[PDB]
Design a protein around this ligand. Structure first.
Ligand SMILES: CCCCCCCCCCCCCCCC(=O)O
Ligand SMILES: CCCCCCCCCCCCCCCC(=O)O
Ligand SMILES: [Fe+2]
Ligand SMILES: [Fe+2]
Ligand SMILES: [Fe+2]
Ligand SMILES: [Fe+2]
Ligand SMILES: [Mn+2]
Ligand SMILES: [Mn+2]
Lengths: 284, 272
């Protein structure tokens, strides 16, 4: 039952940080995946050798499943904050969810356009990937339906916003630019990634706001955050190692396009992102 | 756990009706309540007598609470269809939810601008209004977390889309235009109502799609739909009666518009 309604008893809290982020989301999140021209991506992909064609698919496989999970799995956080009466957070999260729908859509449109929609890309999800995206993420989010304690909310935000978005997704944007933008390939995909990277800046800010406000109540939760970050790292790097090992086995795309793909620089960027995210939460 | 992912094994079902509605929602649903200029609404409201001022508040109180409930209470429907693997429905519902967020925002910005944001408007929710929006609506939606049976989904869409949106909300837009558009009052609010009414056409389409696809499996669900509609009618008309009595502009014309919408919504679902 509803006890009453905030915008009947009072108004929206116009100065709330999540209302301000909601306003930025509406202003800055206008792109439509349906407007991206993928006709050159189709030609690029068809001109690749079958072995150059493979080079790109593990990353796309990781993002398609990642964004699809993100779309489904943010719903429990919106429910939990709604139940807590956090109306401005909920408003913001409608833009978060609609962003993720556009991200799932964008990657699926690319796969359709380049002619791999019919290919099952699950083969590029190794055990570490599955531990994060098939298991740990939905588990942490679904918990919130029955347990919205500070510990549960910190864990959900850590897995979703700080690891999946703030570490893996961020490193995936960078990787995509380091390879395909340098090669001059897949302009529509890169246009999509750029829009998506802009959206995700807000998503990470929501995760920081959420973790920090809970840490602010009791510094003890800061140790929980660091611990949960560290619990997931073995699967973060276990998946990065797998993609790295795949990239190192099929190198014709790098050879062909004179790319010196520095996977050790990429691996270093993942480590950088992970420690950067930790640093954006403070004990006090 | 996730078993797999549709956009990894295959793609979005591009021809799905809810994917098509999602595409339409992106193309058509671009407005921003923050762009509406409410400066003349403030002057219009200050120009009213105290008695005229209060006459305007019950309808706004009903909408502000209604849109806030809608924002919160669509989440279980999104969850239940997500759990059923109905990805295109879920994509569409992200536009549904962000629409309701704009609707809540719009009416709250209007209250702030005209100077009643500090006034507790709960006094204009009578028992019938509370039965629907404080109780029946969240009850039917939340049920879906533990019971996503056809009967539960039909009931949820009936209360939310066919009664709250298709009957009360539709009749409220009409009412605002019959009274204030004709009076030349609150142009910012009426601009908002117009955008909101465009959005809500899609929301009603989702409810029709959802109810009819379940009805298509079994005509016993058609009778359930009609029963749930009739079960809520006394509170619908109990609230309309309350608003009409406060108003005392053809109220019998408005009251008949409500009945018209109610019967219209029933006729948009077919037994067959
Ligand atoms: C060799 C370096 C590898 C770099 C890591 C590649 C990461 C692939 C990204 C897939 C998951 C991203 C999903 C984000 C969803 C969301 O917005 O929450
Ligand atoms: C005098 C005739 C009265 C006509 C009916 C007035 C009803 C007031 C509006 C309140 C309901 C708002 C519902 C929100 C709709 C949504 O789910 O998006
Ligand atoms: Fe995100
Ligand atoms: Fe391993
Ligand atoms: Fe609606
Ligand atoms: Fe009554
Ligand atoms: Mn995303
Ligand atoms: Mn609405």
């Amino acid at each position: 039952h509803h006890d009453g309604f905030q915008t009947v008893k009072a108004t929206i809290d116009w100065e709330h940080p999540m209302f301000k982020l909601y306003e930025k989301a509406k202003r800055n999140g206008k792109w439509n995946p349906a407007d991206i021209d993928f006709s050159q991506d189709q030609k690029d992909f068809a001109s690749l050798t079958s072995e150059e064609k493979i080079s790109a698919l593990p990353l796309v496989a990781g993002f398609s499943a990642g964004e699809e999970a993100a779309t489904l799995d943010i719903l429990p956080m919106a429910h939990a904050l709604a139940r807590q009466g956090r109306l401005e957070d909920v408003l913001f999260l409608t833009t978060f969810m609609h962003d993720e729908a556009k991200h799932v859509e964008m990657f699926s449109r690319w796969q359709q356009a380049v002619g791999i929609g019919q290919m099952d890309l699950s083969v590029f999800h190794n055990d570490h990937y599955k531990r994060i995206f098939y298991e740990a993420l939905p588990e942490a989010m679904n918990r919130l339906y029955a347990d919205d304690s500070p510990e549960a909310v910190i864990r959900a935000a850590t897995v979703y916003n700080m690891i999946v978005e703030g570490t893996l997704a961020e490193s995936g944007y960078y990787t995509f630019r380091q390879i395909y933008k340098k090669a001059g390939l897949f302009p529509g995909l890169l246009q999509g990634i750029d829009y998506l990277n802009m959206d995700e800046g807000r998503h990470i800010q929501f995760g920081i706001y959420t973790i920090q406000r809970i840490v602010n109540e009791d510094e003890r939760y800061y140790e929980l955050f660091i611990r949960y970050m560290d619990e997931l790292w073995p699967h973060v790097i276990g998946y990065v190692d797998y993609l790295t090992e795949l990239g190192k086995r099929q190198q014709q795309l790098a050879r062909t396009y004179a790319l010196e793909i520095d996977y050790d620089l990429l691996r270093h960027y993942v480590i950088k992102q992970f420690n950067l995210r930790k640093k954006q939460i403070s004990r006090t």
